[PDB]
């Protein structure tokens, strides 16, 4: 609001804040003495947060040189006897936490039992050049010598209260430093503020946005410790690779990054379900047992999946030492048995290993039910909710009546527990609000089920009823339609069916007609390079299958020509007692040209008897030459040439993605060459302005933060996120093209 | 130096110098460097050859034992698939390094049951191991050299 | 080569206006700028 | 990195390099933070006094 902001610029508020800034710094250092006034210190620092956020809101929407930031630095330099010392309290208190436990000085002979006296660190700090002047004496004075007649108590309590204000003042100085350069009075302060500033470097994310002014402006925020650690886990790290490959490889520009917001949206679900499982620090007592057991599966799912390889390779090593004999050891008397090299442990070992392999496979499928099934259900639930809210896929227009996905989704609409895993439990009530007046709302209640649709007006408005629970409620408190829908989608995806395929040969493997080895082939998909090979065959399935058909027909013409004319030549020797002419029948001849024919160098002519100048000599020699000229050296080379080229293409696509990312900004459309006009310009640019994680962190605390506490720019983003309009992203400018003439 | 000092023994091992001395040529050096340029992918692919052939050996051991028999004037105990080690090595030596796949060396199925089951075995073997997968092994480092 | 020519035609149409000589990158400076542009201004049927 | 640890204690470390003063430069730089005597232990510094 330019009016209110401009009015406050010319008011007496500058005088007020400088008075506050002077008085705040004095009593807080006075109040730190003896720790009696810590409650008041909490209140003062808590109010200082409210002071700084007022200043930040004043700074919102400014020009690079708007004269409000200029007035702000004029206020600040007028407080030059005060803005330094307020920073120095944080400087000392951060630095001592760094210094303690990071040198030779420790507990040592003062008190190993954690009851150190006053002289524990009297002038150990004096060796360091960090503290000088009366500051070291001030720390000694502020050293609460309680029970003089501690490292773990002195520095400990001054971390929780001072966190927020230190981050906020760091934000203010950082934003001011970027907004108005060529202000050397401001440049003095950042040397003093360097320690606290670099401490909050991991927890100061930075975002560029656009909208409402056709201008780029920065945003600053806090990040939780746990979420920063959670994103760095290997599972989410892998999922980043899987998403980022697809959208850059084939996604269009318009649909480039609705998928990206969707990826962020369900990526939140990944940390949530991962946050439930943890290393956490009698019917009633059974629940804790099953919860601990299933969570133990959920953490180490990939590890036991790798264990299946060791079981498979080890059992298949024992599969070699076999023999057969005319009789059992001591005419339809085959006997399969071992040939162990003078050691009897192998035969018991095979039974033991088989039992273990079956068990660990069952562990894989149970853990996969716990872990990834929530995510795929989340995807389908989100698809139905967004499509119903913003479109008429089941109310305005039916589907195409060919896609099974749309038809199978029809059943869950009537159920009451439809948005089980999705966040919002109100989409059913939103669609009737939108498409209520056009269509019959009662019919719409029929489409959604809407159990007690009349009660939906006052389901939880008139009162909040709550009848009690009971035992064995699970046997009659489950929606059968919803569960059937769940099982259908769970069986539809490829990944779960692969585990079931593993299970069928695993259970059948205890029969052990050598079929343990079938696991060993397709288990090796986990290698990326090997997986590309198997994917290459189906990459050109249509073209390949048509080409194999043309092989099947072009050879068939040669067979009928041979059947008419060249019957006498095809004769395998039997010492002149040969009824083995293999072209007295079309099925025999056609199969002969497959087995003995194409899979042989030189074509047919190698195997058939030589034409010894016995009529049709030229007619025969052209037959073999034209056969070899068409089927083998040309057409079979097409069959070879298709997928090998495809394999090269797929490898080139992967390398293309990796090269394309480095040479072009992902979010912003600007190429890397513009940012290559500075040392580390592109690297710093993609590090901070478009980090690709800070945006994901941006969407999180917006969900976590209360609606009343949203700032101006924060609420500006959140409104469009509800409305699903992806315009506020920059898409052409990155705070530098706007201000290229003045300065970055 | 080691082969040089050992060469005074002179069990023909002077010739080992002659191979790797020719690295000084640039064009020749590129050839030797090309093999290790894609070592990871090559080694994984050779592993897939080793396993995809192993499935064919166990299928043959169950069903097609009678066919594998080298002639000894009807005094032949030389059935080379009465033992998995023998059969698996047979598919390496006599098998992959031969045009047309396995079917050239084995006795012809003379309409003696499992005819379609046998003809598909040799065709699918030749269709996967030789004309495709071995061509991948050839195609990797030649592309790397380019 | 022939397969590459067919794919070349399909890729060349998307990255360049057919009737007008202007490349698609100029109309890519708006959401759906090229798509709306080729939808209405040069539809290839409306001329017929 | 592990194999390079041994040469630090030796006196004739910069035998072939030009500068024979890097041992004296690092203690000037990182002297006040860490214990300079411990730094003499890291570099050897025969007769550090
Ligand atoms: N917003 C972005 N704009 C442009 N490039 C980006 C963006 N985010 C990431 N990148 C690029 O993606 C890659 C980042 O990789 P990632 O964050 O996965 O780190 P890593 O696991 O250490 O691996 P690597 O950097 O080798 O890919 C770098 O090429 C970086 O330039
Ligand atoms: N005047 C034009 N200028 C530029 N591109 C055009 C023009 N007319 C058509 N195109 C492009 O040609 C294609 C139009 O295809 P067509 O009208 O045959 O529709 P379709 O049968 O649904 O198939 P498809 O869009 O997949 O080719 C799109 O790539 C469109 O961008
Ligand atoms: Ca508010
Ligand atoms: Zn960017
Ligand atoms: Zn046009």
Swiss-Prot record, chain C:
Disulfide bonds: none annotated. It is found in: Sarcoplasmic reticulum membrane. The N-terminus is blocked. ATP binds at residues 13-18, 38-44. Detected in skeletal muscle (at protein level). Fast- or slow-twitch skeletal muscle. Homotetramer. Can also form heterotetramers with RYR2. Identified in a complex composed of RYR1, PDE4D, PKA, FKBP1A and protein phosphatase 1 (PP1). Repeated very high-level exercise decreases interaction with PDE4D and protein phosphatase 1 (PP1). Interacts with CALM; CALM with bound calcium inhibits the RYR1 channel activity. Interacts with S100A1. Interacts with FKBP1A; this stabilizes the closed conformation of the channel. Interacts with CACNA1S; interaction with CACNA1S is important for activation of the RYR1 channel. Interacts with CACNB1. Binding of [3H]ryanodine indicates that the heterozygous channel is activated by Ca(2+) concentrations 4-fold lower than normal. Single-cell analysis of cotransfected cells shows a significantly increased resting cytoplasmic Ca(2+) level and a significantly reduced luminal Ca(2+) level. The calcium release channel activity resides in the C-terminal region while the remaining part of the protein constitutes the 'foot' structure spanning the junctional gap between the sarcoplasmic reticulum (SR) and the T-tubule. Pore opening is mediated via the cytoplasmic calcium-binding domains that mediate a small rotation of the channel-forming transmembrane regions that then leads to channel opening. Belongs to the ryanodine receptor (TC 1.A.3.1) family. RYR1 subfamily. Cytosolic calcium-activated calcium channel that mediates the release of Ca(2+) from the sarcoplasmic reticulum into the cytosol and thereby plays a key role in triggering muscle contraction following depolarization of T-tubules. Repeated very high-level exercise increases the open probability of the channel and leads to Ca(2+) leaking into the cytoplasm. Can also mediate the release of Ca(2+) from intracellular stores in neurons, and may thereby promote prolonged Ca(2+) signaling in the brain. Required for normal embryonic development of muscle fibers and skeletal muscle. This is Ryanodine receptor 1. It comes from Oryctolagus cuniculus (Rabbit). The gene is RYR1. The chain holds residues 4942 to 4989 of 5037 of the full protein.
């Amino acid at each position: 609001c330019t009016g209110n902001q401009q009015s406050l610029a010319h008011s007496r508020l500058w005088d007020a804040v400088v008075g506050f800034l002077h008085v705040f710094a004095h009593m807080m250092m006075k109040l730190a003495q003896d720790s009696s006034q810590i409650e008041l210190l909490k209140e003062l620092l808590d109010l200082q947060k409210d002071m700084v956020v007022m200043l930040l809101s004043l700074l919102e929407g400014n020009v690079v040189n708007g004269m409000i930031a200029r007035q702000m630095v004029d206020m600040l330099v007028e407080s030059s006897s005060n803005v330094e010392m307020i920073l120095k309290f944080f400087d000392m208190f951060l630095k001592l936490k760094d210094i303690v436990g990071s040198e030779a000085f420790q507990d040592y002979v003062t008190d190993p039992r954690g009851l150190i006296s006053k002289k524990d660190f009297q002038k150990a700090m004096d060796s360091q050049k960090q503290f000088t002047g009366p500051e070291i004496q001030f720390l000694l004075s502020c050293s609460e010598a309680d029970e003089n007649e501690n490292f773990e108590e002195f520095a400990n309590r001054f971390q929780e209260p001072a966190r927020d204000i230190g981050f906020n003042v760091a934000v203010l100085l950082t934003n001011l430093s970027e907004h108005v350069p060529h202000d050397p009075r401001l440049r003095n302060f950042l040397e003093l503020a360097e320690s606290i500033l670099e401490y909050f470097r991991p927890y100061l994310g930075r975002i560029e946005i656009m909208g409402a002014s056709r201008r780029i402006e920065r945003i600053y925020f806090e990040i939780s410790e746990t979420n920063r650690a959670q994103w760095e886990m290997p599972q989410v790290k892998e999922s980043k690779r899987q998403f980022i490959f697809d959208v850059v490889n084939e996604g269009g520009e318009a649909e480039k990054m609705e998928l990206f917001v969707s990826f962020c949206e369900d990526t939140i679900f990944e940390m949530q379900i991962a946050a439930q499982i943890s290393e956490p620090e009698f019917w009633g007592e059974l629940e804790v047992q099953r919860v601990k057991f299933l969570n133990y599966l959920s953490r180490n799912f990939y590890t036991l999946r790798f264990l299946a390889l060791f079981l498979a390779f080890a059992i298949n090593f024992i599969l070699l030492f076999y023999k057969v004999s005319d009789s059992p050891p001591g005419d339809e008397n085959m006997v399969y048995y071992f040939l162990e090299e003078s050691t009897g442990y192998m035969e018991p070992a095979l039974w033991c290993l088989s039992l273990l392999h079956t068990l660990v496979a069952f562990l894989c499928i149970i853990g996969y039910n716990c872990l990834k099934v929530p995510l795929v259900i989340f995807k389908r639930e989100k698809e139905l909710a967004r499509k119903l809210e913003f479109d008429g896929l089941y109310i305005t227009e039916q589907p195409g009546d060919d896609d099974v996905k749309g038809q199978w989704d029809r059943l869950v609409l009537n159920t009451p527990s439809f948005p089980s895993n999705y966040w919002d439990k109100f989409v059913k009530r939103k669609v009737l609000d939108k498409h209520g007046d056009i269509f019959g709302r009662e019919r719409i209640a029929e489409l959604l089920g809407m159990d007690l649709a009349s009660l939906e007006i006052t389901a939880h408005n008139e009162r909040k009823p709550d009848p009690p629970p009971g035992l064995l409620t699970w046997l009659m408190s489950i929606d059968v339609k919803y569960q059937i829908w769940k099982f259908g989608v769970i069986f539809t995806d490829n990944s779960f069916l692969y585990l079931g395929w593993y299970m069928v040969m695993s259970l059948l493997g205890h029969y052990n007609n050598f079929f343990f080895a079938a696991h060993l082939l397709d288990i090796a998909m986990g290698v990326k390079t090997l997986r590309t090979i198997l994917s290459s065959v189906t990459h050109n399935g249509k073209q390949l299958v048509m080409t194999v058909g043309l092989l099947a027909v072009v050879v068939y013409l040669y067979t009928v020509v041979a059947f008419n004319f060249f019957r006498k030549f095809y004769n395998k020797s039997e010492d002149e007692d040969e009824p083995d002419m293999k072209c007295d029948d079309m099925m025999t001849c056609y199969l002969f040209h497959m087995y003995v024919g194409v899979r042989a160098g030189g074509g047919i002519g190698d195997e058939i008897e030589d034409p010894a100048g016995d009529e049709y000599e030229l007619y025969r020699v052209v037959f073999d030459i034209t056969f070899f000229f068409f089927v083998i050296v040309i057409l079979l080379a097409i069959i070879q040439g298709l997928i090998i080229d495809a394999f090269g293409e797929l490898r080139d696509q992967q390398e293309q993605v990796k090269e394309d990312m480095e040479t072009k900004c992902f979010i912003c459309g600007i190429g890397s060459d513009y940012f290559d006009t500075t040392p580390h310009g592109f690297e710093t640019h993609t590090l901070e302005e478009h980090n690709l994680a800070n945006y994901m962190f941006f969407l999180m605390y917006l969900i976590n933060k209360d609606e009343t506490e949203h700032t101006g720019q924060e609420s500006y983003v959140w409104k469009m996120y509800q409305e699903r309009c992806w315009d506020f992203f920059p898409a052409g400018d990155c705070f530098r093209k706007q201000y290229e003439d003045q300065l970055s």
